[PDB]
Design an enzyme around this catalytic site. Structure first.
Site, PDB file in Angstrom:
ATOM      1  N   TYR D 215       0.811  -1.212   0.000  1.00  0.00           N
ATOM      2  CA  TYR D 215       0.000   0.000   0.000  1.00  0.00           C
ATOM      3  C   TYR D 215       0.844   1.262   0.000  1.00  0.00           C
ATOM      4  N   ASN D 219      -0.011   4.479  -2.097  1.00  0.00           N
ATOM      5  CA  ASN D 219      -0.301   5.785  -1.530  1.00  0.00           C
ATOM      6  C   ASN D 219       0.609   6.865  -2.075  1.00  0.00           C
ATOM      7  N   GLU D 245     -12.629  24.918 -11.532  1.00  0.00           N
ATOM      8  CA  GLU D 245     -12.600  24.638 -12.958  1.00  0.00           C
ATOM      9  C   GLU D 245     -12.951  23.198 -13.295  1.00  0.00           C
TER      10      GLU D 245
END
EC number: 3.6.5.-
Lengths: 46, 118, 429, 430, 35, 426, 440
Positions: D215, D219, D245
């Site tokens: 992980y 990440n 936007e």
């Protein structure tokens, strides 16, 4: 120096081994780009 | 989407001129004019309206895979000249019996130019 | 005495404005802190067309910079010429536009238009005899288009006799830098057609094509495209600033240009632009400015004038030249090419000649063409607008701030009738 | 000015916010004790003692994830009340995380956001990081987005989420949660970029040569997408893009706000040697289905909108030429009613390499956020697996018996059964 | 700057008016002509 | 004032057209850089016929170098005179022809014809009074013959009363440097019939029969065979550039050569070439330039006029010679040998005297002759077309671009008519 | 420009690719690790390598090749050899289990498994070329992946790429010697299904190249390394008008339009004349007309069929070195006067000449001599109509009793494709007959 460019007044260098062309015409991002030749055929200094 | 035409400058955007050596998406050479107010063909949250005539085609686009592609794929070029009539007929029938290959998104856009010798 | 007030809106307007003021400061010899360091005495005579005088011989520009967040004017201040702009001429807000014409026009831009109007009224009541206002902006964003047209409407309701002049970066045909462009483009063209006196159309594909096939830059940037826009921006207002043998101001260009009031969108071009190392293959004379102003692959507009008919043409020259050569070529091109020129106007070209060439050149020229082949812009925008609008493609964003549903309808009918008006004067006998 | 308040909910929110905030300290000069040895204001806020403290709120219902933060390297950087913990977790349950356990902690997170909204002058909007599969990432997060709307109004609420993967999954009861939170945030959220853990596993295996990733290798890749979304509020650019936007250019309809995510030049340092990484090479690889971040294929649906976020040593014409090659191919096909298509944004600060990282040091980059009809399988496959267990009433007693009426299973399955027809008819011709 | 490009906040509000709140602040990391 | 805009097409055109600018430049005193370093004032007085003016006192040719793949113009650029050309004049595509006429004519050339006719239109309208164009090309190839006929076709419809010359290199009678020669050369003479004002025929064995038999070169390259083509490209256009006791431009030789408009294929020559050791043995008079213009073995066309009848004759002279002696020999060869001259023209020979000889030479002489012995160049290509065509040999490479079969029928039959149109007068 | 995408397939294709790409590195300046010795000029000095080599930013040249196989043991000495750093690693595609001399395993079962992986890699190399001349295909008919998957490479090339020029070199099976037993079933079924899909197809067979290394060179016992060295000196001479300065240029498009008159007949045969030994070039002057005659010699041919049995449909001469354009003419005119060569009636022009200035290269430790002139030839002859008759012979032999047919029927393939792809070839045997008749 001093000879006219008539057929027969031109000497061929028999020692020349390099005959590659410099890429003076190229494309960059779809546009034709012309570069001035800095080097002649075989890398001869223009 | 639709490709368009930079009118002066279509030659840098030609598809072989951007190093794409395969079949490509064509462009719109001429833009047609219209006037007035455009009718809202679709109601809210993107539903097409009931009485608007929907197209017969699939909603998801027709990409032909590998295990979906037909066996014995016909050739891309098939000029019929200098051929017998029966052999040229077999080539055109080979092209004819695969309508799903010629209609895909990544489909074969063939060539049938010329007339075979009778 | 003939002051011109500058208005920059959006991030496009701010970067174009920074490059343009750098160009004028180079031309008049104002150093990056504000003091005159020039050579001639012509550089200092009519400096008041752009530069207000402060105490101690400092020249502060007559510009107003507008944005809806200061993320662009940090970058404007941190440049080379960021120290010459006055600190009070920067107007900003707290929240951005978000590529939304409705948030540019109604919701966020309404609380800022009062401050901008206060600043521009303070600059306008300091001019001895003001001529008008320039706006440089983009028809794709939210601050530039929405708030910019709000400013144009509220300027032209209050100063209704002066000149209104816009440089608009209209959308490009191949690649669009916003999905939701043609809504903003339609809703801004519908306002420009009522409330501007002149509008020049600029396309970035045209600017890229000029900086690749003609200037032969290998890697152009926006810091060069803005130089092209500024160099043709400060060439239409030279005769207010320098002497000449045939002067012409912006009023005279408008008078000789627009024959009908709804038809005021123009196509620019700039003559003596030449390559990097191909300077020794090209002479610099008046026919070599004419054949490059009128070349159809030189327009800054991405519309071909060979589809239509030149209603009018203007040419603004800089340098010491000959009136016989100038008038000879502006008659000669008309007689040689007579399917792209209308016939109910018998002469079509207006010529002005100014004296002082740009700093580096011998001659220069600028061309402003008014053609009925600019309607391809509006037909393409109309077709993409009806393609999205018939299915309510992005329509909830616009509708959720109090926008009506009839406003898209009336905008598209107005632009389609303008298209039919162009086609009527093309097909007129 | 131009601030951003990150909110991280759950273990999949906290552990992403340990790799996002390791980058932001290092992209600016900030040491892991708060001292700098003025663009940090979008994420940091200077105290009178010289000590920069981040604008973030970490939320969990279990102490074993945040007590690693309070003991690790960054224990002096974080304010002690910016990390909130409960005592009992939600235990893969929507009901516990929404009604019984999540309600005792919802009234204290809104105390902390109210202070962090009183220091920002111009606040752009919030960011949410959660996981659909968990109990607090799906039950408590759907309780934040209901209470954010009435208390703050029209502020932007972006969100990132770990959508469930097509084959692999941690838990059994994940399709009950992934439906019951999509139904109740569908009117309360602005835009939801989605990655799933399986398609990032197939990038770190294939693009980088990391067999058996972890992980922490995942990440760090997500932290390079969040860094390139807010990259134009901090570093100088040629075409800026705010956080306002994104909703206006990718959400054509208020029930359709699920884009995808792609970050193009992810390569290893043994392959950056071999290849040039020009603007056209990285633009063409955003649209490639081997490099997407959800296991759904855009060739089997119609595009609806796109948003390209270039970053580095880029030039405006190489952006314009490379897009026009995408517009010519027959495999990138658009919907009937979208004739323009694109949004571009150009920044100058090249991406920042993290010590211990995996990606190479590169000079250009593209982050693309595209909205596609091809996600229609992702809800229709998940709709099978909700229907498959619920047809004979499985695991329901773990949901009725904690503060939850039973009728929320029939209405949250009725409601998303309109969403499958909703995707279908907007791609249909005229 | 030419490696770092930090934008320092020059403009802003204080006592609920528009002000140039900096008045001694760098440029893009380097000093202005006020050093 | 009487400008000539040069064109050159393909790997034969860009090898003929590179030596021709090395024989004109030294004729007028122009360095490799481009500057003028001359020793008279006739070397600069009438230089605008071929050389555009550039900036700084520098001169640039009007060459439009055309090719379908730029490999054979990288070698031209790297020579000793490669920097004299404006680089915008280079026209080139990406993939070539493959010695295929249709690919050069219909398919790949037609995508490159609109970029050429921007270049010539930028130079044909930058002349004070344009006299006419040229073209150096080979009929055997794919882009010489292929698009080089599309060029003449699409500029005769835009400038239809100027001059259009071609120096062809029509194929060879013994050894053919392309298998598919008779399809290309039949299909291209048929274009040149209704589209040229003049056209000169050049075979490459007739250039070999000079440099072995006459010039005595043991190793003659194509450098010394391009140098013979470019020593008669300048004889025809000298009286324009250099003063004379009697003048002749390009039009006047055209007026005095063609009795009927279908009959415009000529055969060149060049007199004072001499062998290695025989220069000290040579007599230097005027009637020994009339011996070697008219010697039936030194035409550049490999078609002996002993089989045929001289319809008309030209002659251009370079030197300060006497007008009695020039006119005496034209009375001499016509009145000894009068079985090779037609009867319904009583003086077939047009004469012209320029004054400025080639450098190092005391005299010089050039010839152009219109014959019925040149229809045998067109018979031989017919039977090698219609042997190859009645069994449908290579036709799928041509019809697969979409051609018709009856288009081959007329280009046979139009060339069959000009074979029998010439054959009335023998 | 002028780019060419090489595709090598099979163990034969890989081991030929290792021979050619060592020649190309020495022919230009490239080291075995990619770099040049430093260019010592201003900017980019020589850009001649762009037909075969790309260039990164840093000064590393990566070839435009794809190496394909279905057994892992052949590419794993390309990957851990001298040239292991030259090749980008993803260009070298291996399977896990090979095709095992089955066309059917290599076409329907294992070839379809691996087709879409390598047609993604040839997209990437074909989107790097500003001007692409055409591909090259290097295979052998005998093997499974050299016949089966190679024939399906050409078919999916025609769909995707249209009428782009797809050349192929091949190792046609030998008449007397043979590796395998099942090679006629392979060789018939792939000439049937590449027949309308291939543009041109040059053939050599290993038995004829055995006859030259033993005899003309003084190298007894030639291994395949000495045969693969000669194949690289034919591919180099086909492509040296694209890289080095020429007097007459020839592309890769001028061979199909000049040796393939009719749609079913695309079979020219290669030859290379001054392949000579370093003890016997001390004695022989190698002129331009001395090496022209030795491409027409039935001993120095490179296939085991005599051209004298048939009629020369066309020719294509490739002259390379220190030649004269006049002595090229001075030898062709001589050759036509002999009556031991016989051109077909409907081809009165015959030839196609090409003259190139760069002399052929000396490989360190190679076989040949440092020779100053050379001639290559691709000629198309009616004398190949004796080669299918020795392949109809050995197909109908084992097919009338239906040996080995169970190894193709249960391997994903019906059985009626056997009794039509030999009937399909049965027209080609009479089709080579009627172009052998004179037009009376």
């Amino acid at each position: 120096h001093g000879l006219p460019f008539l057929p027969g007044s031109s000497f061929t260098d028999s020692t020349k081994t390099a005959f590659h062309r410099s890429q003076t015409l190229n494309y960059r991002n779809g546009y034709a780009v012309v570069r001035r030749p800095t080097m002649g055929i075989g890398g001869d200094r223009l | 989407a639709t490709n368009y035409s930079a009118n002066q400058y279509e030659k840098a955007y030609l598809p072989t001129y951007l190093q794409n050596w395969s079949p490509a998406r064509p462009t719109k050479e001429k833009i047609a004019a219209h006037e007035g107010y455009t009718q809202i063909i679709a109601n809210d949250r993107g539903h097409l309206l009931p009485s608007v005539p929907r197209s017969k085609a699939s909603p998801w686009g027709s990409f032909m895979g590998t295990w979906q592609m037909p066996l014995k794929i016909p050739p891309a070029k098939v000029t019929l000249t200098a051929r017998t009539t029966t052999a040229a007929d077999n080539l055109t029938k080979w092209i004819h019996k695969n309508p799903d290959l010629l209609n895909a998104c990544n489909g074969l856009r063939p060539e049938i130019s010329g007339k075979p010798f009778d | 005495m003939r002051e011109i007030v500058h208005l920059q809106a959006g991030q496009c307007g701010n970067q174009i404005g920074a490059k343009f003021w750098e160009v004028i400061s180079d031309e008049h010899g104002i150093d990056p802190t504000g003091t005159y360091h020039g050579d001639s005495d012509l550089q200092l005579e009519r400096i008041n067309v752009y530069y207000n005088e402060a105490t101690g011989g400092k020249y502060v520009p007559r510009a107003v910079l507008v944005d809806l967040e200061p993320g662009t004017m940090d970058s404007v201040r941190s440049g080379p010429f960021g120290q010459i702009f006055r600190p009070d001429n920067f107007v900003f807000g707290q929240s951005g536009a978000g590529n939304n014409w409705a948030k540019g026009h109604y919701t966020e831009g309404a609380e800022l238009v009062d401050s901008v109007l206060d600043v521009v009224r303070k600059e306008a009541e300091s001019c001895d005899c003001l001529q008008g206002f320039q706006l440089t902006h983009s028809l794709g964003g939210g601050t530039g288009s929405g708030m910019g047209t709000l400013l144009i409407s509220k300027i032209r309701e209050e100063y209704p006799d002066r000149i209104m002049n816009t440089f608009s970066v209209v959308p490009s045909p191949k690649v669009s830098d916003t999905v939701v462009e043609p809504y903003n483009a339609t809703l801004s063209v519908h306002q420009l057609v009522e409330n501007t006196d002149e509008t020049y159309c600029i396309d970035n594909e045209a600017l890229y094509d000029i900086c690749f096939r003609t200037l032969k830059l290998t890697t152009p940037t926006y810091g060069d495209l803005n130089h092209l826009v500024s160099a043709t921006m400060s060439g239409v207002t030279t005769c207010l600033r320098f002497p000449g043998q045939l002067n012409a101001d912006l009023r005279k260009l408008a008078v000789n240009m627009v024959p009908f009031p709804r038809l005021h969108f123009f196509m620019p071009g700039f003559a003596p632009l030449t390559s990097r190392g191909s300077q020794q293959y090209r002479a610099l004379t008046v026919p070599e400015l004419t054949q490059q102003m009128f070349d159809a692959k030189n327009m800054m507009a991405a519309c071909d004038p060979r589809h239509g008919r030149y209603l009018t043409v203007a040419a603004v020259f800089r340098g010491r030249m000959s009136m016989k050569e100038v008038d000879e070529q502006m008659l000669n091109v008309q007689n040689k090419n007579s399917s792209y020129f209308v016939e109910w106007i018998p002469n079509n070209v207006k010529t002005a000649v100014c004296d002082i060439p740009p700093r580096g050149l011998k001659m220069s020229a600028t061309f402003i063409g008014n053609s009925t082949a600019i309607q391809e812009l509006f037909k393409r925008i109309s077709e993409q607008f009806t393609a999205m609008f018939r299915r309510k493609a992005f329509l909830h964003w616009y509708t959720g701030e109090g926008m009506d549903e009839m406003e898209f309808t009336e905008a598209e009918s107005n632009m389609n009738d303008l298209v039919s008006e162009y086609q009527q004067y093309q097909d007129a006998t | 000015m131009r601030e951003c308040i990150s909110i991280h909910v759950g273990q999949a929110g906290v552990q992403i916010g340990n790799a996002c905030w390791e980058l932001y300290c290092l992209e600016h000069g900030i040491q892991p004790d708060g001292q700098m040895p003025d663009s940090f204001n979008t994420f940091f806020s200077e105290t009178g003692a010289g000590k920069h403290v981040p604008r973030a709120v970490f939320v969990d219902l279990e102490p074993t994830v945040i007590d690693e933060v309070r003991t690790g390297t960054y224990r002096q950087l974080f304010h002690p009340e910016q990390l909130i913990t409960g005592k009992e977790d939600a235990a893969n349950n929507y009901a516990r995380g929404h009604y019984t356990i999540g309600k005792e902690i919802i009234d204290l997170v809104l105390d902390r956001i109210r202070k962090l909204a009183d220091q920002c002058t111009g606040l752009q909007g919030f960011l949410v990081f959660h996981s659909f599969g968990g109990g607090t990432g799906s039950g408590f997060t759907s309780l934040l987005m209901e209470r954010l709307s009435v208390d703050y109004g029209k502020k932007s609420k972006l969100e990132f989420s770990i959508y469930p993967a097509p084959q692999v999954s941690t838990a059994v009861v994940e399709p009950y949660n992934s439906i019951l939170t999509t139904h109740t945030t569908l009117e309360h959220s602005d835009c939801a970029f989605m990655v799933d853990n399986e398609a990032i596993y197939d990038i770190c295996r294939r693009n980088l040569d990391i067999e058996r990733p972890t992980y922490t290798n995942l990440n760090r890749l997500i932290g390079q997408i969040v860094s390139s979304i807010t990259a134009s509020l901090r570093f100088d650019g040629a075409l800026n893009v705010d956080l306002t936007e994104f909703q206006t250019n990718l959400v054509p309809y208020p029930r359709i706000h699920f884009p995808l995510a792609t970050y193009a030049p992810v390569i290893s340092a043994e392959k950056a040697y071999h290849e040039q990484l020009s603007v056209a090479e990285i633009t063409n690889a955003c649209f490639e289905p081997a490099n997407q971040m959800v296991k759904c294929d855009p060739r089997h649906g119609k595009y609806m909108a796109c948003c390209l976020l270039y970053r580095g040593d880029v030039v405006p014409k190489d952006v314009n030429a490379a897009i026009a090659t995408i517009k010519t191919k027959r495999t990138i096909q658009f919907v009937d009613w979208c004739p323009t298509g694109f949004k571009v944004g150009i920044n100058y600060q090249p991406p920042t390499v993290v010590p211990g990282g995996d990606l190479a040091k590169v000079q250009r980059a593209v982050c693309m956020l595209s909205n596609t009809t091809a996600i229609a399988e992702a809800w229709a496959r998940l709709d099978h697996k909700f229907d498959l267990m619920y047809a004979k009433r499985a695991f329901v007693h773990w949901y009725v018996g904690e503060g939850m009426e039973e009728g929320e299973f029939s209405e949250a399955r009725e409601d998303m059964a309109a969403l499958e027809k909703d995707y279908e008819e907007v791609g249909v011709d005229s | 700057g030419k490696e770092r490009f930090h934008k320092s906040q020059h403009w802003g509000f204080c006592n609920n008016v528009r002000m140039l709140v900096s008045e001694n602040k760098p440029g893009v990391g380097g000093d202005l002509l006020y050093g």
